[PDB]
Amino acid sequence: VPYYCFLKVDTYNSTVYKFLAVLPPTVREIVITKYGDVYVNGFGYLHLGLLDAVTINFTGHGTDDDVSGFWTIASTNFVDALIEVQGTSIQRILYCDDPVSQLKCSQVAFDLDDGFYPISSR
């Protein structure tokens, strides 16, 4: 069937249901941010308050599909990274944690011609 999905909002002596969407059969990532944002397939559907925590109770995959190998939960922090996107999909990543990588991700280049490039002191 089509699945109609709701936030059950619980408060000190109440429950309310806010309707979200007819959830498409084609979701592949959910990312929930500490600052309240929930992004589904890379798009930010929801904004919410600061979160203390999340509980999950995910139910195992539908065993008529391939259902071999792993699905992954990543605990993560925000960082500036240079990303190359093709067809909306990440091809490559570079992390601006060091002064050679901060040069690359200031010139928006994964690799550079020899030269003198302006950099700030650390």
Added chain:
Amino acid sequence: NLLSHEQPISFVTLPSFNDHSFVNITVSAAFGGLSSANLVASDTTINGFSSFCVDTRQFTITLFYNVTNSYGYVSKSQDSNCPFTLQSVNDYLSFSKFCVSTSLLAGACTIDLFGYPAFGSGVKLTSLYFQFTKGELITGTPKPLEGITDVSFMTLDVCTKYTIYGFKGEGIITLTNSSILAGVYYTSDSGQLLAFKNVTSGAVYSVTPCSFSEQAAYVNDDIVGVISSLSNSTFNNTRELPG
């Protein structure tokens, strides 16, 4: 394009059933004085309360006026410190949250409603304070608009007055088989909509403006031919060239 402003309206939004609540706003006042017309006993309510916040994915705002002028009629106007007017909120505007109050709210815009009981300086009947956030889930609407899996409607291949995920314009919407795996809409560097998904299906649709630019060959005070992207035009012959 010859369409004489008979053009269809289109509305594409994240998949919904008809999930509708009205924000009925009642404004009330009484008037008196025989030397000049002046205002007493004003009150305002939103669904019968003093403040309201929308939880349903569609709403309509309505004004009811319940004005009792002895001089026979009242004319009415609005001042808006706001990116909408009440009658415009209904014309498919999309929000993340939307709350309305007869008293100030943290970020609020004001719509002030005025009555002119004897022509000259009017009087404030009420002030409505709107707190809202630009977003995707809650849409203003004219009337509860029917559907079971989706609320959306499109006319394809014809110039349409579209609202698509909060982008407004005139354009031709065409199904393209260039499926794209992330996001919901794709925009130019110019911040204009180029394509969007019907996210309950995966199908992607492309938006093109319904009048394209051309160059007119003008010679001896007539247009003798036109250079175009289009396969058809008012001239009786057409020729295809590489570009």
Added chain:
Amino acid sequence: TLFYNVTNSYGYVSKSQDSNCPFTLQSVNDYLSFSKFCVSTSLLAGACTIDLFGYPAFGSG
């Protein structure tokens, strides 16, 4: 310093600020400098506004 003395029977209140102003109450404390400074509950001549809001049951404050 702000003291709130709010007596909500529903157990708690969240509180927020709007500034038509080049500061916020806790930022005035962070070494700002002035030639004069007056505060009132009623409108002073050149004045900016800080408006203080409570949310006693969540939604409209």
Added chain:
Amino acid sequence: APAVVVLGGYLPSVHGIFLSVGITWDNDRVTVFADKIYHFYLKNAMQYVYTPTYYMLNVTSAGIYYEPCTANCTGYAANVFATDSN
């Protein structure tokens, strides 16, 4: 499809039993393997499994060809990696 893939959980060579089919339990969840494989939520050959196990296999369309796998086999599957330092 005819592909090369890695899988794990509790499965053959306390948290599960296997027979010649089987039952496995962890984290308030029970998985039953029969002709089809099933899941349930429940608070807390005659072969017994005490520790998680991994297998790497490649498919003949009959999946029958495989090698048992050590620690650190998870990094073969395409949607998982060993996270680097920092």
Added chain:
Amino acid sequence: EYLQLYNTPVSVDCATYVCNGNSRCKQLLTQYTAACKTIESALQLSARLESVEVNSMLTIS
């Protein structure tokens, strides 16, 4: 007759100019995609071109 051979080249560190070394501003500046690249490399690739033209017409014997 006087003929100018060269212009004294100038270079900018766009993050230092725009943000005064404020970290939260650098974090915002990276959202303006390649605004810095398209300033810095226009000044650096021009300062390089002057260096190779002028040092290559000043062939001493």
